Structure formats: C-alpha cells, structure tokens
Design a protein around this nucleic acid. Structure first.
Lengths: 158, 187, 178
RNA sequence: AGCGACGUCGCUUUUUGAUCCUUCGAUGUCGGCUCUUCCUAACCUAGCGCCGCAGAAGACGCUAAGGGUUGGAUUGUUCACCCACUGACAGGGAACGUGAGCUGGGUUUAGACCGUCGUGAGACAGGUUGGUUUUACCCUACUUAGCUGGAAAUUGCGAGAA
RNA sequence: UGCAAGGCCGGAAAGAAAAGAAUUAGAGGCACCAAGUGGGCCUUCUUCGGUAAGCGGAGCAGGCGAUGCGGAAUGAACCGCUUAGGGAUAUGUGGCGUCAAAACUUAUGGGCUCAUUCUCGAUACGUGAAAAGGGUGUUGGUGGAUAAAUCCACCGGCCCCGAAAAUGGAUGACGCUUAAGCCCAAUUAGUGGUUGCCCAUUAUUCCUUUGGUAAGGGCGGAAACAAACGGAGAAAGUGUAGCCCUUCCGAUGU
RNA sequence: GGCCAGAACCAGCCCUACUGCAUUAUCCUGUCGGGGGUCAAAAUCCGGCGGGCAAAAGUGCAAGAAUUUUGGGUCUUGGUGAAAUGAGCGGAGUAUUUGAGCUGUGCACGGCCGCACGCACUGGUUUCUUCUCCGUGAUGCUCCAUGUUGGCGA
C-alpha cells in the first residue's frame, strides 16, 4: 500500500471469486433484518455504493439502526490499549445473518425439548458413551509394518 | 580385520636362523648376518626339524600385514646372501672423456669424469669387497662382492650418484656409472 | 556391556470410525532404548507408510521380545540411512554376536563410526541369524573356522580399582603412593 | 614443454570504492632523507625437477627469506621516463612505519597576478610568486654506567649435594 | 390481534447433561493528578536495496539498554538462570589428564584416525575461516563380471594435496596418539535395574530480615504469691526500641 | 560459669539398606527330516511333530512403618521436658488386612452350552500373614528461665 486511500489495499479482498460473478441474488433481497440480530459484514463487490471499509470485511456484530436501504452494525475494533465499539453504516447487500449464535440456541432448544420429554418420561434416548474406554479388539486382518527395499526406489523418481 | 596372517620360508641346510627378540641371525657356509626388526610387530618363529621360518601377524589391518611379507623377503636375502652371495657388476659409460677409476683396497676414486678434475672419491666399508675386472677382458667393470645385499646394493648406487651429470641435458649426455648385472658370488 | 537397544514388537491401528471400522492392525519391530522411542518410531512408519497419525491411532501393546540363549551367531543386518550427500544408501552387513539386539545395536555403532549416521536417520530393514555357509565377508567368515586360536598380545592390564597405586616401586608390586 | 578461450572456484588487503564503528574540550594531514625489523607471491645468491633442454642463453617448477638489491638527468611529487653500472638492480608491511627525528618543495589561510564564471562582494577539486615547523628534566622502552640483597626467593629453626 | 418497538404478567431454568466436551497465583469496572522517555541496538524465523558489510530498511516475538550470577579461556546481546541476608541437600548450561572442583587418566564399551616449520584434530552462535578439483593413504558400501581367488564402475567416513603476509604466539596454556582426537553409547557392567561424579545469587527445604490487596488470635488483668535466709511484660494499635503472638506470599533495577 | 570440648537421649528434617504385582512364545526343550561342515561328528541354520517354567530377565509398575529393644547425618534445626499427643510415651488386652482353597447370581471369554486366569454382590475357610484398643485444654495472653563428662577460670 503506497497511497493509503479509502480502498487502498484490495485487488483480492474485493474481487469476486472465479465464476461466481454476478449482481446480488434475490434471496439476499428477501432476507429481512431485525435490530439486535447478529450479522456478518462481507462486502459484495457488484454493488458500488454502501460498501464497508476494508477493515470491517469479515467481521460480525449486532445490527442496531435499520434504514430503508441501509443497516448499521456494532463491531469491535481493537485500538491501542482498548476496544472501541464501532458503528458502521452499510447497504445490507454486504450483510448476511450470521450463524454464529446458532449451535448455542440449538443447545437451548434441545435442552427444553429434552426437559419436557422427561416431565412425563416417555423415557429418553440413551446416553452415548466414550470411545476412549477400554475394550478387546478382534482383528479381522493383520499386516506387518516394515521398510521395504522397494520403498526406496519409489522415493527417487523420475 | 583378519585374526591371523601367515608368511613362511623354506630354509636350506647349512643355515641356522636364530631369533630371540625381534632380531635375526642367519649363519651360512660363509659369514653371518643380522637384522634388527624390533621396529616391527610380528611373531617370529623358526621351526627346526621342519626346517622353516614363519611370520605371524595377529589381528592386523592392511598396513601391518604388508610388513609381514617383506620380512620373508629380508630373511630370504639374508639366506641367499650368506650362502650364495651377492656380486654387482658396475660399468663406466663415456662418450668422450674416459672415466679413470682406481681402487685402493677399500678406497675408490673417479678421475676425468666428463673431463672434470675434482677427483670424486669413495670409501667402501670393510664388509664389501671392491675390485676391477682386468681390462683386456671386459672394459671398465667394477665388482662389488658381499654377503649383505642391503649393504652391497648401496655402494653400487652410491658410486652411481657421484657421477651424475649436473646441468647439461641428461638424456643427451649419458656419461655415468651404471649397473650391468646383479649375480651371486658362488652358486 | 549389554546392548543399548531393546527389541520391541509394537502393534497398533487407526482408531475405528464410521468411515473405517475395523482398521487393519499393523505389527512392527523396532530397536529402541525406551518404549516411547519404540512407540514414536511406530507412529512414524504409520503416517509415512500407512497415512494414519498418532492422534487418530491406538496402540495395542508395546511389549519387548526376549532374545534366545547366548551362542555365537552370524547375524545379517540390512540397514538404510539418510545422508543428504547420497540420499538414502542401503546396506547389508554381517555381525558376529550373541543376540539380535547385540548385533543390531552393534550395527548402529558401526554406521555411526564409519558412516556418521545417528540413529534417527537409520532404519533397520530386517535382522536374522544366518547359517554359517552364507557368510560372504572374509572378515567374519574367519571366526567359524574350527580350531580357531589366537593369543592376547599388546594388552593393557588395569589393576583392581582398589589397587590403582599411582607410584609403584620398580620391578615390584609394592605401592609407594596409592 | 610453454600457453589456454567459453565457463568456473578461491585467495590477498600493496588499488579504488562502499559503509560511518572509534576519535571534533584536537591522534600533527604529501614526499624525500635517516634507521631498524618483519612477510614471501624468489630478482640475484645455495640445492634440485622438468622442457619444443645438443652447447650457450633461457622457459616453467620445488625446498629456501641466511645474505644482497645501486650511481644519476627531469618532476614537490608517489607514480613515470631515459642514461650508466651490476651477480641482481624483486614486490611489499610495520597508524598508507618514521615531523617533541629533520626538511617544508606540494597542499590548505591572510598579500598579489591571469584566465574562465558572476551585475557584485567573491568562486575555481585551474595556473603563479611569497608565506612562523613550539616543549622532555617525568614513566616506560633502549643504550651504556654504578651500588646491592637474596633458595620458605628477605621469614621456618621447613633439613633434598650432577 | 400478523409483523416493529417499550414494557407488564406468567412458564422453565442438566445455571448448562452425554459425547475426550476446558483451564486459571480470574476481584471485574471507573477516575483524578503527574514524572521520565519520544537518538536505540542485538537475535531465531519472515524480509527489501546492495557483490558484500560488524552496511542500510521493515514484520511477529525475545533480549541488552536498566542486570548481575553460573557457563562457552576472553565478549552487552549467545547458553543456563532471574538477584533480601545466611546454611544444607540437589541440579541447569558446561564439564571430570594437569592448570582446575569432578573418571587418583571410569567400564569387565564398539568403531575410525598418523597429519615434516601459520607445526592433524579437538566449545554451537563465531567466514571468529576456507572452495572447485584431486589421492593404488586407509576403512566401509552399492552394481556388474570372470573363476584361487580376482577384476571393472560408482558412492561414503576420517585423513592428505589444493592452502601465500607482514612483532613471537596461540584447540585458552601444557600436552595428548592402547587419545587427554572424531562418531556412537554406558554408569561400576550378559551379575541379577534401578540416581557415577563436580560447579550456579537456580530448585527444594531450614533460620533471620523487610513489605503486603496481607490472614488469624489475645488484649473485662483468672485465681495464688513481701522482703530476709520461677522473673518480667500485656498499648483496641498505619508508622517507633514495632501492643503481643501464630501463619502465608513477595523481595534485584537505569 | 553467659567460655571451650566430648558422649548419651528427644522432636523434626535429610540420606542410605532392605521388595512385591504383572510380563515373557520371534522363546525353552525333546525328536524327526533336511542342511552344513569334519579324518569323523556335533554346532551355527530352515521345516515338521511332542512337551513346557530359561525361573529367571538389565520387561512395565512398586506402596517394602529404619528403636516396631537397635542403619547413618545434623559444628545445616531446636531441645534436656517450663503442657514430650506418640504405632513411638503410659495403661490393659490378644485384634482383622493380605496371601492360599471355595460358595452362589452376575460380569467377562470361546461358537444356549463350555470357559472363567478368580472382576462386582452378598461376604464362607483360619493354613499362612500383622499387633489392637483407649487415655491428659490453655485455670499458660506474651517472652525469658531447668541436663551429663572433662579442660580452663581461685
């Protein structure tokens, strides 16, 4: 980076992948964003206006303001001794709802559905056990490890 | 690293090969000889009634083994010396200036070599005998008799080197004193 | 003294998984001073030859294999080793010795002496005691000649550690300073 | 023999660079003279190998630095050139050895002249003539010159005879 | 009575199961006032300009600066280590022929090596010295071939030639060659497994000091008690000759 | 005697000696075929078939109470009982941990039976093995004060 411009470092970060070129698909226009929701900021390059800065590409935060064509996101940018909490304004083409929170909110459902399942039983599925615990092994086939005379002429090709 | 290497002789009769330390005294029909082999490491054995001399190197590598077969060579030469003898016939080759040699009993001089007058002169030890073949028979020969070949072959060379031609081209100026033949005294 | 390398049989496999249940349980022989050094050089051949790695693998047992009663034998040890000059030379040599370990550990000392290779670049391909008539090398072929006898020449006789005696009186055994 | 292109591998620190580590409350900054010593990549001297070495003269190489290595014209010169001798007139280092050792021709001041440049004062790594070279009695070194203890190297009485 | 928002009121809450399914010398957070510094330099790895540099310029880190101490003979920075005043035992890096503590030169361990005037070799970092190319020196190996064993090609190890500088001089010195050298390996040696030995301002532990983000206890005088022919203290406390006691951690510094 | 020496005992600390459980088979030992060599054999070596314990291994783990009438050291700690908390000191008695054989259901193993090398549950044997039990608050808040043997000290 010689010139320290606005979008000074990027012929790759902002390039579209090979044979993925195109303008943004419908499915990302028909997503809707509620305030408080987590989001990935990934800048699409086929929409000029509204891009996030080079730093924010690839981060996640909590949407806060929602405007007709815009959004806004709260992202943690570490600075000298501290993390400022930055508010950026993006055109939502660059925004995708994050799956980050997901496996947790699925752990919470599979607890409650578990709990209402014990309430009056029906019992419950069995608890899987460790693979690291003991056992006798009954080998179906057994072979020998050795270094072969032939193994060396394979490592000098040609 | 072989454990044992052998080298053996066959000793003729009239010969007694003696060993105590590493030292060899062989006594033939004429004179005796000796060699001090203490600088080697070998097991020296003389078997009488099998009439043989054997050399053994235990646990040697290629370097000590080489010594093992040069002792047989020195002991063979102490034998053939003390019975048959060694006689080297030495000549004088000259293109122009005749080499004038004269022998007092142990003393040798060489005069008019290449027309020089520096009177090259040698003294031959008492254990080697010097003489000139008398001139109308063959030319310039000088004869070195002796028991010990190690010693006799020295003077034949010592007298050869006095007559080296110093500066002028050697493959052209061939004047020297050379060895014709190397033969035993009697046998 | 005794050899410095134990002789281990290491048996191990990949941990079973839905992709590969019942892995194939390889067996392996190493000469190594410890069983962690034997267990390490096992998972070396496992990822090198079999692509299985120690974090994905299991070890079934590390036990040593004991050596037969002592007799003089002729062992055939075939060893490779890595250099970067020559790039994996391979060797076959014989050794007089009383046990597999005593021969193989003697082969590590010769590679380290003559060829300067140090135990980690070396891998032993095989070892066996061979009958007598197959000894090719005249240097070891000489020890099975019957009636073999040699004296002890150029010895160095160290007295008992208690008797060392710095200054010993000449032509006598009496110790002036011990 | 003696050479050896196209390539290629090194050494040396007697060239010039590159860098700027030491010295700006100061390491006297060119050359000659004098004097000693060291290095060897050997010019002569000693011994030797080899040659397209017949001899004479010489080429190339080996051990070897004990010894030797000049008189001048011109130049401030180092460098360079020519004259002459010689067995030879080898290449160098030592703070580019050597200024409280000298010398002061050069550079590097103040005076002055010319050329070119500048409107001008003035500049020029261009030319020219003239321009102060200070101190040792201290310590060590070195060269000579005296006095004088001392073996448990002053003591222990601690004792060893070429 | 769908979706946005601020609430309110109920619901449940392994307070986060099982599956390898976390750990912590984890008190979080806020504020005021102010010093010095704003010439740095070195190193593993990445790295640009340069033929290169003990050169110039950066990245992630660690150091010296500011810091010794033990070790590499010596060295800012390498190696080990992190410093209150002492003792013991044990060790790290590095070592055990003398200098010089430890093998009074250990083993009842295997090989290899001879090097004639800068004198073979022998502490990483440290080109703080060597290359291409050579060697019927010696010691191994691979491939092929002819048959009493031998021959051809190639590849290693150590050693030798290649290898020339100016004061006398440097494995640190002496010296070493059945190494006191190089590779590998061991611990009183197929005799029983299982820690040879020496040295740190380190580790462990004991005593003494001092400071805590210090922790805890006692402090309503229990009673008795003259000399003559068991004594003395006991303070409601930041700091003292510390109110007394027991305990725990730290302790170097421009 | 507040000085200098030794020697005993006590707590703590350090050190040293003293050993068991598993494991072995690419092994042990017969024998028969080879095969090999030698004057002739045997051995090294391959295979088959029996039997098995090299009884010891430089195998993996180790807990084995060092006054429990006898290991050393402490001039590296403090003491001479001025609260000795002790398996150790005192008092009076003969306890249940292991190892051996086995119970029943269970597990575990082999392709319901057979196995079970002796795992888990009740918990049988006493042949070996070993000590077991219960005793002192401070009415002491703190510090200091109590040996033995000689040398020197009148």
């Amino acid at each position: 980076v010689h010139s320290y411009g606005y979008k000074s470092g990027t012929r790759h970060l902002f390039a579209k992948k090979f044979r993925k070129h195109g303008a943004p698909s419908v499915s990302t226009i028909l997503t809707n964003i509620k305030v408080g929701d987590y989001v990935d900021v990934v800048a699409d390059s086929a929409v000029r206006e509204g891009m996030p800065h080079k730093y924010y590409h690839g981060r996640t935060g909590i949407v806060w303001n929602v405007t007709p064509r815009g959004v806004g996101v709260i992202i943690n940018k570490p600075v000298r001794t501290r993390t400022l909490r930055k508010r950026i304004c993006v055109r939502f083409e660059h925004v995708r709802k994050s799956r980050c929170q997901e496996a947790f909110k699925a752990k919470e459902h599979q607890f409650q559905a578990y709990l209402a399942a014990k309430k009056a039983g029906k019992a419950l599925p069995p608890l899987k056990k460790s693979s690291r615990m003991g056992g006798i092994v009954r080998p179906k086939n057994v072979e020998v490890l050795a270094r072969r005379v032939a193994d060396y002429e394979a490592m000098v090709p040609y | 690293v072989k454990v044992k290497s052998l080298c053996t002789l066959q000793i003729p009769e009239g010969v007694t090969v003696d060993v105590k330390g590493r030292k060899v005294t062989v006594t033939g029909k004429r004179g005796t000889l000796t060699k001090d082999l203490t600088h080697l490491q070998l097991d020296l054995r003389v078997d009488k009634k099998n009439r043989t001399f054997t050399v053994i190197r235990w646990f040697g590598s290629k370097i000590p083994i080489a010594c093992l077969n040069t002792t047989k060579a020195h002991v063979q030469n102490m034998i053939t010396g003390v019975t048959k003898g060694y006689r080297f016939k030495v000549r004088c080759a000259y293109a122009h200036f005749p080499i004038n040699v004269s022998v007092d009993g142990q003393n040798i001089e060489v005069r008019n070599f290449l027309g020089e007058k520096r009177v090259r002169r040698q003294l031959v030890p008492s254990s080697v005998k010097v003489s000139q073949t008398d001139p109308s028979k063959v030319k310039d020969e000088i004869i070195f008799d002796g028991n010990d070949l190690e010693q006799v072959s020295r003077e034949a060379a010592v007298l050869h080197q006095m007559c080296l031609v110093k500066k002028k081209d050697i493959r052209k100026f061939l004047d020297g004193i050379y060895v014709q033949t190397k033969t035993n005294i009697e046998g | 003294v005794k050899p410095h390398l134990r002789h281990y049989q290491v048996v191990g496999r990949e941990s079973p998984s839905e992709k590969n249940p019942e892995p194939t349980v390889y067996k392996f022989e190493v000469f190594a001073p410890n069983f962690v050094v034997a267990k390490s050089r096992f998972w070396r051949m496992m990822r090198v030859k079999n692509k299985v790695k120690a974090t994905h693998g299991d070890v079934l047992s590390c036990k040593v294999v004991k050596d037969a009663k002592l007799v003089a034998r002729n062992y055939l040890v075939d060893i490779a080793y890595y250099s970067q000059r020559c790039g994996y030379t391979r060797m076959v040599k014989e050794f007089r010795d009383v046990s597999k370990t005593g021969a193989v550990s003697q082969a590590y000392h010769d590679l380290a002496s003559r060829h300067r290779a140090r135990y980690h670049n070396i891998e032993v391909l095989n070892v066996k005691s061979i009958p007598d008539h197959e000894v090719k090398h005249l240097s070891i072929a000489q020890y099975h000649a019957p009636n073999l006898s040699f004296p002890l020449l150029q010895r160095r006789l160290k007295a008992a550690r208690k008797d060392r005696a710095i200054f010993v009186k000449k032509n006598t055994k009496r110790a002036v300073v011990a």
